[PDB]
Every structure is written in C-alpha cells, then in structure tokens.
Write an enzyme that holds these catalytic residues in place. Structure first.
Site, PDB file in Angstrom:
ATOM      1  N   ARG A  84      31.205  16.685  -0.783  1.00 45.78           N
ATOM      2  CA  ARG A  84      29.943  17.091  -0.181  1.00 45.78           C
ATOM      3  C   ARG A  84      29.249  15.953   0.590  1.00 45.78           C
ATOM      4  NH1 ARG A  84      28.259  16.616  -5.738  1.00 45.78           N
ATOM      5  NH2 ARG A  84      27.063  14.648  -6.051  1.00 45.78           N
ATOM      6  N   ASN A 111      29.379  21.940  -8.303  1.00 46.93           N
ATOM      7  CA  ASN A 111      30.640  21.591  -8.943  1.00 46.93           C
ATOM      8  C   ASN A 111      30.715  22.244 -10.324  1.00 46.93           C
ATOM      9  OD1 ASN A 111      30.342  19.786  -6.680  1.00 46.93           O
ATOM     10  ND2 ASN A 111      30.903  17.968  -7.849  1.00 46.93           N
TER      11      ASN A 111
END
Length: 92
Positions: free
Chosen positions: A20, A38
């Site tokens: 990310r 996540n």
C-alpha cells in the site's frame, strides 16, 4: 446508478512489504475512494468505488506485482455495494 465498488482479496506474501505505497498516488489520478487493509492470515484486502474501468487502471499494478519481494500466490474479486458515498481513500 453508475458507481460500482468491488472488493479484491490478495493471497500470498503481500502484507509487510508495504504494498500500500503507490496505491495512494495512483488513486489520486483516478479520484476513486476505498481502502487497503490486511488480513490476519498473511493476505491484503483492497476496496475501490467508481467506474470499474477507471478502477482497473490502478489495479494494473496490483495484478502486475510491483514489489518483487511480494509473493502474489492468488487473488479473488467480488461485487461491493457499500451504503452512502465514501469520502477519500485510506489505509489500515
């Protein structure tokens, strides 16, 4: 009716490498919303609104596996219809 959000679950070694990273920059070009969280099993959940086509422009990088340190084992996609309109893109 125009906006078509979708949820993309990425398997394999994706969390920890900071996948990310560019997601923010790219997201700014499309002007879409969403977030990149996540899982607790080693996997990364990515969500995005707007026109599928526009969303797919940044998803090119997801399905390309930018960081070679990552091990993209598998990835699954499903339809996402969240209530209201999201403000901006963010992260975990």
């Amino acid at each position: 009716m125009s906006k078509v959000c979708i949820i993309a679950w990425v398997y394999g070694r994706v969390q920890g490498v900071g996948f990310r990273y560019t997601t923010q920059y790219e997201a700014k070009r499309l002007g879409l919303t969403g977030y990149a969280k996540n899982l607790d099993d080693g996997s990364v959940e990515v969500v995005a609104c707007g026109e599928e086509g526009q969303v797919e422009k940044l998803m090119q990088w997801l399905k390309s596996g930018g960081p070679r340190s990552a091990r993209v084992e598998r990835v699954l996609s499903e339809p996402h219809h969240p209530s209201g309109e999201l403000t901006d893109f963010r992260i975990r």
